[model samples]
Target: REHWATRLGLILAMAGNAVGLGNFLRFPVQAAENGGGAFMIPYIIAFLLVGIPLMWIEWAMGRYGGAQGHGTTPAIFYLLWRNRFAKILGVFGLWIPLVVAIYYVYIESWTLGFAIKFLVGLVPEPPPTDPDSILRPFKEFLYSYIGVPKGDEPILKPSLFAYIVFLITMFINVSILIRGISKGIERFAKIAMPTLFILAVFLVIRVFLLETPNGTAADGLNFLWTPDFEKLKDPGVWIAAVGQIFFTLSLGFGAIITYASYVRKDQDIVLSGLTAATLNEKAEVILGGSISIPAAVAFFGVANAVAIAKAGAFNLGFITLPAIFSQTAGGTFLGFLWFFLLFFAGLTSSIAIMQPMIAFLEDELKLSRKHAVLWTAAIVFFSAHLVMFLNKSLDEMDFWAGTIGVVFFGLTELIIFFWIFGADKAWEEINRGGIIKVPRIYYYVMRYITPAFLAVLLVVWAREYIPKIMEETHWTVWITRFYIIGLFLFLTFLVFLAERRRNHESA
Candidate 1:
């Protein structure tokens, strides 16, 4: 098995997996909606109980599995529990990341297209000082760029330019995957992750210096930092924070396990896992919080920024930020930086998302690295069009892969690690080669607190979305669900074939 060449490379690659487009596009919107500064209280709680512990669990599992010559979760879970049914539960670890990557790369393409267009001044400049008209040009540009129709209802128009960019983005990801772990992912992470930080910091500094007519940069910070103490009483606020922690960390996506699988047997996962988690937190809270919301408030005022956030994360990242940058003094250059920054975040994450299935093909199916990437890319490339054309297709995929599927897999992970495998052994595995000691309290936290917390999260999301699923009548929505079901069965069949192959070889 391939191993990471260096500790720094491993850490950066791990952090790259965790720090995704969500850090910029989704975090600020979630924070703004969930009580701004007050959201941090529950968020921090979730991070300690849910995020950090799970990071360690995944890393330990990956290293353990890799030592046994299995990188993907099917074999990993079978090893953990010594039960054949565990492999079936393990398929979620494979399916969630693969399914998420299909739509994720399409969204990633948008950032690249926007960045290029902004650099060439193709994105429209904001009109003169009419409050309503100021956003009109920017809104139209976004609609055209993403192929959203001009009518009240959304219909996919299939922009030729967007398709070309999507192909280009898909090509780049496959190229990276074909290079294998040490040469491709680690080398790219060493460059892209640092560049991502530099770009984000530059944008944050510029946002801090802004002093607009409607609101100053200070006003933006005030809006984000000023706690609504009463929000602590709201259950929805807590749920939002918990969801953000899961989404932001890429916990249940399966990429982390694949990435960590490349580590040497004695490599220090406890310290490395904690470091990566902290790096992700810094990106989301410090840099991400500072950029879009602050820039939006600086240009459009606090009230308008709040309204933009309410419209959706897409509107904030694609619509409002573009409008804000277009109105700024060196608007074109700043516009390029903002979208390009997101492009880097998206690229790093999308590649990481592709790796688990690639690993599975190589490890279980006995395919070569290039062959594995070829199959993975071809399937994802075609399946993504389902999301690209239909409006509800992307929404349905996100709800399953991004929200419900992730939480469900996380619960299964805790069950295998703590309940079936035995909590004492799991804790010892997590600490086996550690340089920095994890405190004794996490043993109980992982065994009890995290599982209960995740159970509540799983139940809440199921209750919320199950009713909607039962009532849904849209043809596009049903088609997407069927497509997802088909993919799941396809993967399960592959797993069965792999097990039989292993048995044959041993016999």
Candidate 2:
């Protein structure tokens, strides 16, 4: 279990995984939309309550798992299966990453393909005529490659080209996995992460250089900083902030646990996790916001910045950002740099995504790395294709994966850590490093404030869904409702299975 090779390597790998497209593109938009700079208030609060604690919980679990030479699920179940109730929940924890990996890789592929095109100077120029015109050519290119037939509305449909590209990217990703922890994942992070940060800083500097007719960078900076406090009164703001926090940090999934599991017991994991989390948020809020929103402000002005911000979290990154970058100074080079940054960010996180699933197959099924990587990659590839094939299905899947999957896993993690694992023990692990001491108030936030806040936010968000479920207007709505219900049921069943298996083993 003396893996991770070095503390620096672990830090780089974790930092790489933490910084993703969300940090560069989505977080700023979300922050601006939710409450602009003021969104940082709840965001920082959520970080302290939800993000940091959840990270520490995963770190402790991973350390325990690694010390025992077990993967994520087996390690968790092995520890918790002592109680029938806990065993059941353990099973769900095991499967969450598997479910997430399916769609996640598809999104990663989008980043990879875009990165390649940007590098090759194949990215379409933003239309000089109509702003919306730029979207058409790119959308057409995506659909043509992905094999989505032309339709009245543009939705992702899988094409043979898309399938091929998806499979090839997965192959590349998995091949890296076969090289093992330190040499494969860590080395890639060391190189790719530095490049990502450098490119991001360069783009930020260039965007700041853009001047309005007024001879001030004020328009750009204001667009980034100005908070619309009215957004705070809306429940959607809280939900978006929470969702962004979860997504950006890549928490609630077992990736952190899997990655951290490779650490040596004396490695001082709590501080490592905190460092990673802090860096991740900084990348998103400060760097990501500065690069993305300010550029949009320079190109599209304040109205468009606000509109893009309100278009939902990450919309700016995926939809609006490419256009913004294509219009900037050294536009071609900047486009390539931005997408390349996004690609590597996605790549580093993809390593985290693959780790737990690969570990599970190796430990639980006794499969080798080659077999596990091949199988998991195959499953994710096919599942993602299905998502691409059906527009309605893809929409539902995105919502489920992005929101429900994330929030559920986050809530479950908190419960398991605070109630089941013992908060005091977790805190001791969290404070192991002795570098930055967490205040005592965190315990109260972890146990009560965080959960209560999520609960209230969930109810507020569900207000619309609860009625729609009862009054289904279309097959799409029905399917979405059932999908959510099925996800809950599937999670419940996993818990039952784990408990049953544990009882059988004990007996």
Candidate 3:
């Protein structure tokens, strides 16, 4: 068993993986769009009811699977349910991450690239000849790096510099991945997690201290902290909080399971699991929360603060943030440090995203670690081109793989873990090697409250998005959806073949 070399390493890696662009960029913005401080009420409710419960479930599931010499969900699900359908359903846990990581790297690399650019003091040069030029904000360089010349090119073109850094990021992840868990992922996590926190600490300090020309940091804090009872009355607010909790905690992804699988049998997961959740929350509410929203309010006042970390978060991060940095005191230094933290956050997560499938191959297909890693590399490298060559494919995959697939996967895992595997047994497992008593209340929550919440989440998302698809869908949307579905079927077929082969070889 590749148990963590140190408990701290495992905990730190867990936090590192959980704390990502989602925490820093997405969470605060989600809070804003959902209903400011009003949303935090349900956010806290979901955290206790949904997030922590799910955390315990995934941890127990992973450790249980690992103790039995299984790493991926397919075999693990089969082990628990003894059903072929369960095995295949578990493939979502594998496939979503494998696919999402493909496009996700292109974005993650931008943070790395941004850090490199900042280090070298290379800023975007204003387009002197272009009439529409906007004095070339620092984010313009980011747009150019991604192949959007002046941010409005019609025909999609691949960015060479972007691709280079993309591969570099891939290389870094694989190098860490190749080293078995104890040595590679855990070691890197030890370093990256600490460095990430240090950078964030610096930014939080800088963000709070800076005096905006218009509003004060306190204004941003009040906007986020003060709740509106009327907004809380909206059903949409509760649903939005659930969605935010899921996304921010990196739920429904196979990532937490893969990371927790390294836990030694009989190790207490209760404290560590909640600790990771708490650490992620602190980063989101304290560090990330303070930076973007407060900075936006301070810099642009209350109304316009919506631009940063809000609706189109990618635009705000890449376009608005760099420009904000240019305006803020010593922002160049802050921007550099901020992106570096984001790069670390992305790297920590990208490591877990693909590991489950790779581990599945190693455990079930009997492929060597190097062989599995190389195979994933090839798959991600090619699929990412879909995003690079046809930009809309990124959004397509993000919605289906990142957003939709997550809800599906989470529901499936929960139903199977609690219902099929039996909620009573799962509860017992959660208490195994207990550092703290998981409140008995969670037993009912996992069986009833959590699944009910997830079901609501599933329905709400489909109700909203499916009709949107029907109204404004394109040919590419259908084709891309087919591609992901086809890929899963083809992969399941391969797994079926491999297991049969293993049986034959044993015979």
In candidate 2, what are the lDDT values of residues 1-507, reduced to their tens digit?
Answer: 338886788888999888986787667767556546667666766777788877877787777777777757544744734565555555555556655566667767776776667767776755574657865566565555555556655455565645665777788888888888988988887788788888878877777786654333446566556666666676666777788888888787778888888888777886788889988877776678787776666666667667867765445665566665665656767766776777778778877877876786666545687888887777667656556665555545546565667787777767776666777876776666545676788778877887888888788878755465345633654554465456547645644554466567668
**Higher-lDDT candidate of 1 and 3:** 1
> TM-score: which candidate is best?
1
Candidate 1, residues 1-507, lDDT tens digits: the string is 899998999999988898998899889898877757788788877888999998899898888888888899888999898877898888988889888888899999999998889888776756567656767787778778778756755467767889999999999998887888789989999999999999999999988887878877777777788777888877677777877787888888777888888989898999999999999999998999888888778888777788888977687888777777767789789989988999989998899889889889999999999889999999999998888877768877877888778777877887898788878888888898889978899988888898987887667656765686757656668788889989999999999999889889899
State each model's CA lDDT, in order.
Answer: 0.85, 0.70, 0.79
Off by over 4 Å in 1: 150-154, 464-466
Sorted on TM-score, highest at the top, how do the candidates line up? 1, 3, 2
Query: Which pairs in model 3 have colliding backbones?
Result: none
TM-scores for all candidates: the values are 0.97, 0.87, 0.94
How close to the true structure is residue 277 of candidate 1, measured as C-alpha lDDT? Answer: 94
Predictions: Cα RMSD each = 1.5, 3.6, 2.7
Give me the overall lDDT of model 3: 0.79
Clashing pairs in 1: none
Preferred candidate (TM-score higher): 2 or 3: 3
